[PDB]
Amino acid sequence: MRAVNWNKKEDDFSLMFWKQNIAQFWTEEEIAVSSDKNTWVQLSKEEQIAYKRVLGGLTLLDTKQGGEGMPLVLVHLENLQAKSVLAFMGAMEEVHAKSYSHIFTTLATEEEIDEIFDWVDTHPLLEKKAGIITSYYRRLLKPEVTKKELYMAMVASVFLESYLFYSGFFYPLYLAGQGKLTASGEIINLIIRDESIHGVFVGILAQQIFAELSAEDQQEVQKETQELLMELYEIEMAYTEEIYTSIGLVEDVNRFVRYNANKGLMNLGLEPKFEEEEINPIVLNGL
Amino acid sequence: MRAVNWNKKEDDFSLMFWKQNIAQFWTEEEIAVSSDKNTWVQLSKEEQIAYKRVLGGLTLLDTKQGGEGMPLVLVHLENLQAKSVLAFMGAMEEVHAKSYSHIFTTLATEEEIDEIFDWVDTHPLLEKKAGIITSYYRRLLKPEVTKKELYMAMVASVFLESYLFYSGFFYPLYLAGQGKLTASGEIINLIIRDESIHGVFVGILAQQIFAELSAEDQQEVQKETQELLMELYEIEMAYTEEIYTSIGLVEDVNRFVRYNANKGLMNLGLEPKFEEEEINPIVLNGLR
Ligand SMILES: [Fe+3]
Ligand SMILES: [Fe+3]
Ligand SMILES: [Fe+3]
Ligand SMILES: [Fe+3]
Known about the structure:
The structure is a homodimer.
Chain A: H1 14-23, H2 37-40, H3 45-76, H4 80-107, H5 110-121, H6 124-138, H7 147-164, H8 166-176, H9 182-212, H10 215-244, H11 250-267, H12 281-286
Helix pairs in contact in A: 1-4, 3-4, 3-5, 3-6, 3-7, 3-8, 4-9, 6-7, 6-10, 7-9, 7-10, 7-11, 8-9, 8-11, 10-11
Residues 62, 65, 93, 96, 191, 194-195 of chain B line the site of one fe (iii) ion.
């Protein structure tokens, strides 16, 4: 049985991603967010509700990525150096998830926080979208998986980390770009700096597996990938309407969702499927 | 579907373990090992071989703990705060495994290193030992597990974390306790500082599951636990004989194995099974 041997490379990229993930290590104690209360009170009830809801959704996605997506993909990888990188990424997803609780502690009472999480648990679109992604992960709960099964779990993972988080990240960035909740925005930027490299790395691994598939299996997962992209897109458009109609941002968020879907496709080595639009300039200022 | 909510505790210990694991964070670039060359060359050929073999075995165990043990135990936990801790622990196992490569780069040529890893891969006792532990983890590759299956995977994990590593950790500590390979010894001490808290934490989780089992299931896993302890003990005694006979340390290491088996049992809330024997005094100095 093999032990990981970093003195013989298993691929051309795991070491650089290992070093970059480590170099980016952080925890929430590093960013105090009490100073955000001054701008929090300037928001309306509807703005505060939208913010709390989106962060709740992000927390759910990170919970599933650290607790199901990274563990189950990594268990079935044969490359021990790449597996090492995924294990570190999974730990960072738990740091990300916990960092949302650090923000909530400053912005909400204990009762308001347990309302957020009750709303998350019972929410039908979050249940549907998380269920679609984790169905691919839960297919890996068996002793031997096919490469198609592993590939599709990697596709689901890239779509979560490069695409599905963005209908939520939009709002903290948009507010930070307007000088509101800027300490929380710094946390979100640290999360995004990690997520960006997560989706690239998993996308590299997915492209490697794809090239190992038979032609018949390639055709199958190519079609399933495009269907999944658009199945998730329909749900995201329903989610954005629900979260953002009250604050007049639906179409803006939808543009941002499309921009990030294209990035997720590119991370998989696939062509964009939505028209190229430039990033909202307020969001850009928040980045 | 539930998201982790750290503003409502799911238990009385996950937050403290989370904070401690994070406070202990380290990577292999923090400890330069070049200066160990001056004592490395003073070791005999037999001593150098034993060191390299033990570190190769340790690498294998961490490789399996980070890549199977932590992921498969955590995926089936219902407690999202405890799952978070296990995910961080699994990442640290990868740091541990990689740190052995950093030591090897100083102590061995490229060809000698690839020989270490070939000896690990084809080694029958390492294969048997790791296979026994990972069989409990691989049982969890299914959508629905029983609490007996999850409990026994946690037992296997504690036995890896608190017991099986010690036939290998003995020798780096023994040399460091004599002023030899002290930089590598510092790394091993950082690893042990993590491993100790890993085994304590998983042992707490195992005790919680155990209390939910029926009395019949409790007596079944108690029997499996005692048998597994001794199945691993027989293999460890063969392993210590193979590794340490050339350098006269077999009985010392066996005493250390028994001491750490007792620690593993106590991490699970169980009584010791080996007579109390104080730790080798030089090993204790390598831990100081
Ligand atoms: Fe994340
Ligand atoms: Fe991520
Ligand atoms: Fe370890
Ligand atoms: Fe450990």
